[model samples]
Each structure stands twice: as C-alpha cells, then as structure tokens.
Target: LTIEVLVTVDGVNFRTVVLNNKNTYRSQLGCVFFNGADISDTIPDEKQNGHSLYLADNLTADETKALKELYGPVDPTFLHRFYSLKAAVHGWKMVVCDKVRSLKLSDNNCYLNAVIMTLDLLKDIKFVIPALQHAFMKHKGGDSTDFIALIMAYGNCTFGAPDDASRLLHTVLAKAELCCSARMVWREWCNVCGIKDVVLQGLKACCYVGVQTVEDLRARMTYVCQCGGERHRQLVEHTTPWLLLSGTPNEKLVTTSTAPDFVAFNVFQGIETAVGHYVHARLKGGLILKFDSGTVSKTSDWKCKVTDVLFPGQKYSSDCN
Candidate 1:
C-alpha cells in the first residue's frame, strides 16, 4: 500500500508519500520524499515545530494563564485554532501515524494537493493570529521562544551540544525579557513626547531592527537618547557640580578642556589656571581661556573634581568671572 501525508519541516510544507508493504507500519519521524525528481527530507527535530508542540503540551498550565492575564479572555476558539494550525504546520508526524494504518493506493498528485491545502491553511491562520506572523519574522527560521519552551517541556532531553544549548537558553530568556521591557518603555516615551497615530508606529518600527543576536540588541539599546529641548538645556546649565566639589577641599583636581573655534592658549597652562582659580577662589570663580592645541592628552592621574564642565556657546555670561 502507498499513501501520502502532508508535513512541515522548518516552517516549509512538504508532501511525504509513504510506501507500506504487508502490515508493517513505518514511522514518519524520519522520511524522505520527492516532487518530480526534486527530493526533500523532513527534519524530525525542527526547532519551531518542537516549540509548537511544547506550547501545545504546556499551554494549560503556564502560557494560557499568562495570555489570559495579559490579553484577557483569550477566545477558546484560539485554542482550537492554535491546534488546528499546529497540526497543519507541525503535526504531520502524528497525522501520518493515524492515517497510515488504513493505507490504500493513492496518486502522488493527491499528496501534492494535500500539501498545497495545508500551506493555504497556514496563510489563513497568519491573519487570525497576527502574533504568529510577527513571530515568523522576529524569531527567524525557528521561534526562539518556542524552541526554549520545547527545551523546558522536555527537561531531560539532551541537546547535541549541551554547553551551547545552555548558553543559548540563558541568552534567549534574557533577550525576551529585554525586548518586552524595551517595548513598554517605547510606548511610554511615545505617549510622553506627544507622539501619536502613525508617527509613533514609525518610531517603533525601526527600534528593533537588526536585533537578531544579543550583541545586536545591546547595540540597539545603546542608541537610545534621552529627550532634549529647553528642559535639557536648563538641566545642563543650572546643575552646579562645583557645590559638590567644594565639600572635599583636599581632593586633587585635574582638568580637561575642548577648544572651540577661534579660541587659542596653552593647553597645560590654561587647565592649570582654571583649576587653580576654581579651587583657590572658594568655588566662586571660573576661567575663560583658549587652547592652541585642539587635542590635550593627559598622562598623569587625570582625576577631576566636578563630574564635567561645559562652556556655553555664543550667548556667553560672566556669572563665574
């Protein structure tokens, strides 16, 4: 007897035609198939499929509880729909086991049609569960969350490389939490900045770009800049670091300065005078000087009082003179 079963491997659908002789049953776990001379082998342990199965098995205890708490009253229809979709995409092994027993001679075209139908079903599911669609892109070929869940479900199962698996497991969990927190902050920041409608969406759309790896996500986080405007300028201008430095009189002072255009003086001598006056004048004075060299390299202790000192632009004031 010959039969065809529709299956999915690594998110791609395939038609696995089986040949059964006598009453012996063949496990579809590891099967090879061909479509018009093109051969494709099903991956028995695809990560996303493992994740789908993991989710299905543990949904009642954890995922369902969390989803209900966050989304509220997750339609029971979703549970049914979830399984139906999973079966269409990841449950091929089970489907073949059940149907293979009553094997009958079937045309290869029938299997091909089944594969097409399954793929169509997935397209429909994408619309119903938009998160899954997002997952496809966010998680790449394998849903890391699902893969992690699968590992959780089969606690004892040995991954080929134990060290690598453990490292990945830790990394994925951390990234998941980091992404969630980042999204929350993004929404709050948008609200505070009076960003609404499509503009807010546009800002968020580019936020997570190239965040496939932990290093990539870290780099993305570094790009975030605090809001600026009048408020930022005021904070920088009015915040006095000299008051903090005054408390510790014996603290050694080292000065660093960046010279702007048309300003000229001796870098070492200028820094010396600035620190001398600022300290000796009992924190009531400041310096206005220039440097001949744009770059000043410090070789000694280079420690400093007052976290930083800034010179305002064209609108100069003599408050510290």
Candidate 2:
C-alpha cells in the first residue's frame, strides 16, 4: 500500500500542515487500528510522506503490518481510471469499512448507499437530505410524485441525446402531470454542480421542439405554478402547442410579457392577427368557442375587452359594466 501527499498544493504545504501527525504510529506498521472507528478527530492518517499507498476490521496488529502495496508503477492508465470514477467510493469505503470494524455506516453502510444511489441511479426527487440526517442520527429513506420525476431528471444528466428532458417533460404533461419534479431535479443537479443559473440555462436550452395538445396545455399550467412564469412559458414554446402557432410566419409572436404565469399560453389562433389566438389581459377575455366542418361560433361575449387587453387590473370578470 502507498499514499502520496503534496508538499505544496496551490501553495499550501504539508511540511507546515503536517508538522503534522504523532510519532507513536509513524515508525511501526504494527500500530493497532480501531477500524471503522469514528476517526476520533483525525486525518493526519497514521502514515503520510507522499509515497502513495494504501484498511478493514478493527485491524489486527499483524494485518496492519501486513498491508500490501499495489504493484509499483503509475501511468496514464492510473490517471484515466482515477478520472473515470464518478465518486470517491474508494475513500468512502475506507472511512466506513464493513469488513474491519463494528460499523462505519451500519450493517450495509446505508447512509453512504443513499448517497451513491442518489448520485448514480438518479434516485429520489424528494431527496434524502433530511431523511439522510435521520438515518445518520438513527441510519436510512425516497418520496412522492416528484421523487420519480426527479429521478427522471438525474437520468437526464447521463443522457447524451439532446432534448431528452423536454421529451420527459412532454411525457409528464401528457398525463396531465406537473413538471415541478423534473424542474427540481434539473435545478438541483446544477445547484450541486455549481452556478445553477448558468447551468440551468444550458439544460433549459434543451426543451424539446416536439408538439403537444390542449390537454397537454393544462398539465403544463401546473408546471407554471411551481416554476418561474417566464421560464414555463419559454419551455412550452419549444413543444407542440407552440408548433401550432407557426403558420408559416407572416408575423411574429407578441405574448412575451410577464402579464401572468397562466396567461403566457393561449389555446387558439387569433383570426384578427394570424398569430396564436391568445388570452389577453390577466383576466383573459370572455371564453370563445369555435366548431369546425363549416364551423359555428358562440360565446364571444367579451365583457373586459377594454381593461383586459391592456392590464386586466380589476381581473374580476373584467371590472364589470
């Protein structure tokens, strides 16, 4: 077993830092390791001198002395394998080795397991931060709807294909489901990775270009309730419903304001503008109904046409007569 420490890392030196550990264990490999011990205020591990080497059980005195080193030779393969690791499982294993001591993290190291499952399987949208604490204080737990949908998002991380998140978004909405779950995972992955705003923008940029229906419309409405109104609107614009508004581009879309979260999306094309027939004002004008195949129209009774298209300040059925 071997270990390496930097005498100077980013200008920090082990010479001073490790003025560093005790001498009792330094000279002999026979020092008894308590194994899986709570580490009792330590990390100047028993041995250090930048030799890169290599734990288990309350290590027997002989086992400690017998620890073997990997075949001596470091190369590009060693670096590649190191980089390939998604997490420091080896380090975690040493911290909580089951084979050596009482228990580093319980019978199966479930708390650490939670971290791995959460990281690798994209498990739990509900997240186990609190439950993990419970398990740590006690040891283990997952969740509600957002849980799986959230897992769906982490899977989004491993995806190499573009717009997979949007496709998943479409599936959620197709069932008339809320998109909050996916959004949470998306935000979280970036949040943990760093710079959520910039990272989120990169992921949100993948919103699908596929199409959807009015039924799917209501589902995304629920999405707006949890996520930002403008972003929800931006997300919907890339999917199917927005596709309907593209009638060969004689004009551009005009509903980009932050009037209201719900109002960002409208159900039909405006006969007046040749653009998407959208809701106007916060109140939305009186609901219109159109029937096709030599269609018939009714319920165009808009009471708030004046106040609605402008601001719909009163919002109560258009501030009445």
Candidate 3:
C-alpha cells in the first residue's frame, strides 16, 4: 500500500505511507500540519517601506505564507493587474489598466480597470476636457470628437466642427460663461498655442454668421413667451439699443467789436477778437472790427482796473474785466 503526498503553501504537506499496512492508523491524520507565518512581524517593516501587500481570508495562513515566501516581496505594481483581472469580468475594463501604466488615468497604479472606472465617474464637461486630452494624446482617433472639440464642449459650445466660425464663437462664449473672473482658461490655451488673434477673429466672424442664422430662424418661426402666458414676446429681449451715425462737420460764423474811442484801434480789435472767441458766447453778427486809418502814432501804453458798469461807477471803469 502507498500514500500520496502534496504540498500547499499554508496547508499540510503529507508524507508517503503504505496504504495496505494493517498497523497504520489510516485516518489521514499524520500529515505535517502547517499554517501561514505570523505576518504582523513583517507588516511593520512593510509599512516603513510603504508596501501594502496583504492576503485575504480566501487563502489559508500556511498557503499565504508559503506563497509570499516563495515570491519574496510581491511587486507593488502586480496589485493593479490582480484587481484588473477581477474587474475584467465586466466589459472594456482593460482600458483603465492601460491608462494607468501610461500615467494618463487618475489612479496611482497602472490599472486599466481603475482608469475606466474613473472615467465612468466623470459627468461634467470640465472632466471631459482633460480626459479627452490625455486619451487623445496617448491614443488618437478613439472618438468622433477630437481634443479640440472636448475643450469646446467644456466651453458650452455644441459646434459640430472645430473649423466652423459659429462653432468657434460658441466655444468662446461658453468659456466666457464658465469663468468666474476676467481671466479665461480658453484664452490662456489660445495664447499658449499661439492662436489668440486668429481664433478670436474667426470667432467674431462665426458669431455674426450665427446671428444671421438666428435672424432667419426668427423670421420663419413664430415665438411664444414661456412666461406663463403673460404676453407673446420675442425670444431675445430688446435690452439696449444704439445708433451708429456718420457725417461731415458743418461750419458757422459770427461777429464781434470794441468801442473805437476807448484805446488804440489795434487794441480794440484785439479785445473784440478775444471777447468774440469766448467758448460759450453766441455771435450776433458775421464780422467784427475797428480800424485806425488816420494816425501814424508812436507807441502808447496805459493800464486801468475797470469795474462796475452795472452799478453806475461804483469803482474804476477801466478795471480788468
């Protein structure tokens, strides 16, 4: 009689025995019993090194210890694969694992399953842009929308094509809507990419095109206000209106004069000219003057402080007005 022996990591290893011997206990009870090592002894050291390797209740203590001892320390990276394999029972989960290896996914491990799961959690447009950027940079042509469209989507732009001007406007407007302050991330992107002026110009043109299209739509389709039947109104409110005017300047003329007898004729003309050109004064006639035709006079000088004509000479009449 013969007995078979088998080795398991945390279980018993049996010794060969004669099966037909009458003196044998025959109870399968003489196996060398073994259990897994006390892992608490190693866990402190593992923690020091930032290793998190552990076993579940799925394996016996002896089996777990034997497996770990045989493998030395399991590489931290294998954990990603272990879980990814478990997750692959579903669909397309391997993509996550692939992303992790490339550092394109959110998780710290190279776990494609984790990448896929993380992508599943993103519901906002903000998340979509970075995700697409990473994905597109790593693997091109995975989706209908490219890297540019992903960004535009975050801007609240639904424009189907990146080259379309209206789509560009929609992208800019959408980005403007999301920004809390004057600084815009889309503008930053444009500046970084060296397309700032070109993109903005294209966007302006696209917006005009969109406005025309909207006007046509308004002409063709009747609008009804959604404000609970208060009154029928246009879709867009007439918030503010302005006019653009263009023309040439027209000129006008006036006249001024000073009393001839008061001083030199040239001085009168000078006074009259100064008074006539006063900014707020209205001219009563088209011409103004005084002339000294008779005298070739030597230079004359005088000074006076004129005042109080309305009060019948309360002060000197030649006072400076």
TM-scores for every predicted model: 0.18, 0.18, 0.15
Candidate 1 lDDT over 165-207, as tens digits, reads 2222222222221111111112112223443222211112212
Q: Candidate 3, after superposition: displacement of residue 120 in Å?
A: 18
Candidate 3's TM-score: 0.15
Return the lDDT, model 3, position 304: 18
| TM-score, predicted candidate 2 vs. hidden true structure | 0.18
lDDT of 2 by residue, 101-198 (tens): 11123222222222222122111222223312222222223222222222233233321122222233333222222123232111211212232222
- CA error at residue 88 for candidate 1, angstroms: 20
Query: Where does model 1 exceed 4 Å of error?
Result: 21-148, 151-169, 174-321
lDDT (Cα, 0-100) at 171 in candidate 3: 42
* Stretches of candidate 3 exceeding 4 Å from the true structure: 1-131, 141-219, 224-321
- On a 0 to 1 TM-score scale, where does candidate 1 land against the true structure? 0.18
Q: All candidates' lDDT scores?
A: 0.24, 0.24, 0.24
Q: Rank the candidates by TM-score, best first.
A: 1, 2, 3
